[PDB]
RNA sequence: AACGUGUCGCGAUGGAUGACUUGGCUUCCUAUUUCGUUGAAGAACGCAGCAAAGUGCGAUAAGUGGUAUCAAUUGCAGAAAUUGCCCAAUCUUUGAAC
RNA sequence: GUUCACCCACUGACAGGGAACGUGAGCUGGGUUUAGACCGUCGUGAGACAGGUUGGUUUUACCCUACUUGGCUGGAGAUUG
RNA sequence: ACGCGCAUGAAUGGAUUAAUGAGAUUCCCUCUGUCCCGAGUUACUAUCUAGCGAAACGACAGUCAAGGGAACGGACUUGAA
RNA sequence: AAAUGGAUGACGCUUAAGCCCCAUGUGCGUGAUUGCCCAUUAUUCCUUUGGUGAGGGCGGCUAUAUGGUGAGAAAGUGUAGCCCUCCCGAUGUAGACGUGGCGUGGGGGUGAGGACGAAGCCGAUGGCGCGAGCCUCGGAUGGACCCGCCUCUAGUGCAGAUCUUGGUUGGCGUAGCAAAGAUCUAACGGAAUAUUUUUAAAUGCAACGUUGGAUACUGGAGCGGGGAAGG
RNA sequence: AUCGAACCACCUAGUAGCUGGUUCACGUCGAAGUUUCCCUCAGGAUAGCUGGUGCUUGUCAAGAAGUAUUGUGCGGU
RNA sequence: GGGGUGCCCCCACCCGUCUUGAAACACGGACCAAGGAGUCAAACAGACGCGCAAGGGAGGAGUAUUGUGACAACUCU
RNA sequence: UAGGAAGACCGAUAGCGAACAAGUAGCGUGAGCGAAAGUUUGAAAAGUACUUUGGAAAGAGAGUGACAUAGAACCUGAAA
């Protein structure tokens, strides 16, 4: 469920997918960095982010992964490009879209107020390892949730 | 430390009492009020059908 | 494992014997949980007529008659179901001890059976387990005359020994008297005591000094 | 600045706890109570309208016959018997197997 | 195999030592010290010898610190008054 | 070559032997980056990205000097960063 | 005369802040007999706890309604200690013993509670006890049982045993996914595009199958065509 | 995938003077590593040190003292 | 008065364990839940509770009973 | 083999190995070895018609039910 309630319901839209089979860590870090953005500027960045033209920057899970020079304008110098997180975003953005123009509410003029990503459970493969060893060969997909409110 | 005790001679040395690997060798009396009812019927039965007979 | 116990035949008796007096005392009989409160006298003795009865309306009536009723409504309204575990194994339901109706012999208990709350009993072997229940002594007990003129013979005196129990007399008190206050405070105690003493004077505020030089 | 640290509200991950119990364990009693060449115990293969396992049954194959009870079975069909008990029967390939 | 030793040669000079007898997740594995085998001496024998001889797997750093380079960024009440 | 041989020696076989040997040892010719003394180049890695994604290990942690201490401290005392 | 840079503890100190010795308030050759600082020690005071503890009261007649003052008093080892004074001890490994000392599952008694909400669970909910713990409050938790007191009984209390069984975890988007040479192009297919409102490139990347064409490999002891064992 | 005595089940929870562990609170007391014997030297028995339960008594003192004084003996550092 | 979070001055070696001696460059120690170790029987001794006493106490059996009935009661030249 | 009486016993890591398609799945050439797993939603499936975005999975509404944070291996739902 939602962890937070929306001020003024009738002016706000929602979206949310389980279980995501997208990795934990990369879309922790593309859905974190449209909060407090407007819709349509967000959904600019993730086409720039596809044409490797602009970066997605990486704050938490970034322990030794390469520097970039994209990276300055989110004031840091860590950042990547993960097409599979983010083609993923935008398709849950294009949902959000649809729930605004049912409730009647204007697309262009929503303000994202909310995005939470938390782990989803783990499926489980196995790799075989040197003298005759089994280790395990786990996924980790993700729940996302998001609501915009139109100011 | 031992003092001044008597001697044991407690003779429980065979494999007496019933474990994971042994079957035992013991006897209990669980039935002793039960096999007391049981002798009490079957005389009173006799007696009805050999009556008048002491 | 040793379930169970053996007991001196002596002390058996003892205690039975123990038990039964304690029925006697109304403090104790209001003590262990009874309601008395209605009854005329204790112990109570009743006519022999109570064992021709056949008719459980018959039986409710009398005991509304004698005033032992309460007791039997008080186990009616305390039955509940068991906390815990026993609920599960058969001890579903549970209830306190109401009166005790002791007959002569195990006849004449037609009309007295499916009264919830009253217990039957024959004088001719009488149970600590049910004089006591819960090793709390003081049960409530109700005598038909026959059962009541029985008990000298079973139980014997101080001098004459019981008929029914080989050689068994009723043990001697080891007080003469048990009222101890009354010697306490008798004429004969009361002139051998030492005399009392004077005491001295409550201090006062203004704590008394110490310093012998200053 | 960012990372990091801490507290409160909410949400994830996980399946503890409590209350439940057609299961287990232990003791006691009663019988017109003790298998097989008249082929047993075990083992294999089959059988339902839709039926994999399990249950029952054997080419008369989720059953034929007798008796007591007295209207169902049930997921959908389908019809206008079912359930308990038991005498009469059927009883595939094997197995002491001859 | 040597530390040690001893010779040849150059030189201004070929001083003496320590750092877990510096230094094996730096190397090498000649020696020492398994299992195979030969000799001498010893033992009745299985076997022994600080006697000789030949053949005999050298594993793991992506963690913290130290060191080397490489960048981002606050801060004087050393984040506040 | 020599032999007072700690402790050589005759089927516990002595001495010698052409041919043979992935057997042990010494020297010579040829040849070379083994070395003086290192330099340049290629392919695959490492390095950056997309997708996927472990293990080992893990009391707590991680700047030094001296001191004393279970006689070689990250923590204790004094100093210095 | 020694092996990292380093030690009266450091700085520093030379009419000493060094060595040997002597003194003391206000006033050091007229103030005789205490210059000042720091203990789990000594004196004194308050409270607790245990005694080879020591004393005292306990036969309730002064008199008194509410809207001169109001509550208790148990002949007692042990308490919410019957009450009031006084004296002496109090640390401690291995170990012994005591406790009307705490907590858990079930039996016999007694007394209550519950759909106007039991058990369980949550907490910047406070109060009580030296403590083990007990109780209240709130739940925008739960949905059916449970507890106080006296006794009986036991498979009765966990932080570590390279402990057992589950779950979770930093390391970590890290180490890597490097033998067998290699793919390119157009059309079609596919939801996988040529996806923008706030001219074209600088804002929808990357990747998949078939057919035609190109390039190249296996090189007959073959990534050819048939069998046995095994499946 | 096992050999200076294979594998499976059982006797078997084999024995261990040796290594590891052993779950609530407060209160009153509180040590020893020494003697003799033991195939005894990483262990026991035995006396000593300690706790509990007391018994018989006394109350200023019996059968008191890790101390003096007086008298009288012992000794070869 | 209590509770929460910072700050200042002062104080303050890591727990469990064997050991004469542990903060140790001595061993076991990533985190949480639920499990996890002086028990039962038999012979004897001492302390304490209870009954009787120059006597004490049975056992095995037997007599009478859907009743709290595998209990309880009784069994003497 | 048919039945009965029960219990100061255990209560899903306990009690038989097995409260369940358990001597089953699985392992070993073989003799043999041998689990995990309460379908405990709700009184009753009344188990979410229909609108809309999406290839689908699902999302946003609507509806049943006292409660859907009782939505399907669905009571309660702790700690790390
Ligand atoms: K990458
Ligand atoms: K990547
Ligand atoms: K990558
Ligand atoms: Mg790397
Ligand atoms: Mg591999
Ligand atoms: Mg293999
Ligand atoms: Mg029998
Ligand atoms: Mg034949
Ligand atoms: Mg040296
Ligand atoms: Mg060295
Ligand atoms: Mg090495
Ligand atoms: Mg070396
Ligand atoms: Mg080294
Ligand atoms: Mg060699
Ligand atoms: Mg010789
Ligand atoms: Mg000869
Ligand atoms: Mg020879
Ligand atoms: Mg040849
Ligand atoms: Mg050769
Ligand atoms: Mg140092
Ligand atoms: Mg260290
Ligand atoms: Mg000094
Ligand atoms: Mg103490
Ligand atoms: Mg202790
Ligand atoms: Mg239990
Ligand atoms: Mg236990
Ligand atoms: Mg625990
Ligand atoms: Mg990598
Ligand atoms: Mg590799
Ligand atoms: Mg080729
Ligand atoms: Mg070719
Ligand atoms: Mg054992
Ligand atoms: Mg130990
Ligand atoms: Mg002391
Ligand atoms: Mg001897
Ligand atoms: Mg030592
Ligand atoms: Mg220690
Ligand atoms: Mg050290
Ligand atoms: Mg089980
Ligand atoms: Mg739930
Ligand atoms: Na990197
Ligand atoms: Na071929
Ligand atoms: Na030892
Ligand atoms: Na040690
Ligand atoms: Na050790
Ligand atoms: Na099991």
Not at chain 1, 53 to 61: A, D, E, G, L
Not at chain 3, 79 to 93: D, L, V
Not at chain 3, 162 to 189: C, H, N, W, Y
Request: with cysteine.
């Amino acid at each position: 469920h939602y962890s937070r309630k929306p001020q003024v319901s009738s002016k706000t839209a929602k979206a949310k997918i389980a279980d995501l089979r997208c990795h934990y860590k990369n879309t922790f870090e593309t859905a974190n960095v449209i909060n407090g953005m407007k819709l349509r500027k967000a959904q600019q960045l993730y086409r720039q982010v596809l044409a490797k033209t602009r970066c997605i920057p990486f704050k938490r899970y970034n322990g030794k992964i390469g520097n970039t020079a994209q990276a300055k304008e989110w004031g840091q110098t860590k950042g990547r490009w993960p097409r599979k997180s983010v083609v993923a975003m935008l398709s849950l953005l294009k949902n959000a879209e649809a729930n605004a123009i049912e409730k009647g509410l204007d697309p262009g003029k929503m303000v994202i107020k909310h995005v939470q990503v938390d782990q989803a459970p783990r499926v489980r493969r196995r790799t075989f390892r040197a003298h005759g060893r089994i280790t395990p060969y786990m996924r980790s997909p993700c729940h996302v949730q998001l609501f915009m409110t139109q100011p | 430390p031992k003092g001044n005790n008597a001697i044991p001679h407690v003779h429980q040395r065979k494999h007496w009492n019933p474990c994971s690997s042994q079957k035992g060798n013991v006897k209990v009396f669980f039935n002793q009020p039960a096999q007391k009812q049981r002798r009490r019927r079957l005389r009173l039965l006799k007696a009805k059908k050999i009556f008048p007979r002491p | 494992r040793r379930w169970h116990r053996k007991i001196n035949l002596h002390q058996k008796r003892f205690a039975v014997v123990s038990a039964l007096a304690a029925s006697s005392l109304p403090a104790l009989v209001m003590s262990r949980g009874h309601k008395i409160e209605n009854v005329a006298e204790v112990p109570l003795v009743v006519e022999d007529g109570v064992r021709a009865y056949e008719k459980t309306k018959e039986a409710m009536t009398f005991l509304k008659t004698v005033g032992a009723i309460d007791d039997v409504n008080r186990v009616n309204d305390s039955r509940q179901i068991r906390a815990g575990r026993g609920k599960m194994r058969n001890r579903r339901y549970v209830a306190r001890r109401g009166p005790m109706l002791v007959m002569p012999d195990n006849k004449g208990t037609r009309a007295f059976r499916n009264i919830f709350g009253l217990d039957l009993a024959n004088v001719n072997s009488l149970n600590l387990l049910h004089l006591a229940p819960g090793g709390h002594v003081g049960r409530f007990i109700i005598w038909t005359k026959s059962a009541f003129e029985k008990l000298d013979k079973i139980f014997g005196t101080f001098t004459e020994p019981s008929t029914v129990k080989s050689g068994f007399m009723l043990p001697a008190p080891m007080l003469t008297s048990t009222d101890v206050t009354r010697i306490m405070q008798s004429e004969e105690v009361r002139r051998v005591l030492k005399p009392k003493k004077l005491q001295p004077k409550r201090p006062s505020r203004y704590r008394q000094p110490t310093n012998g030089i200053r």
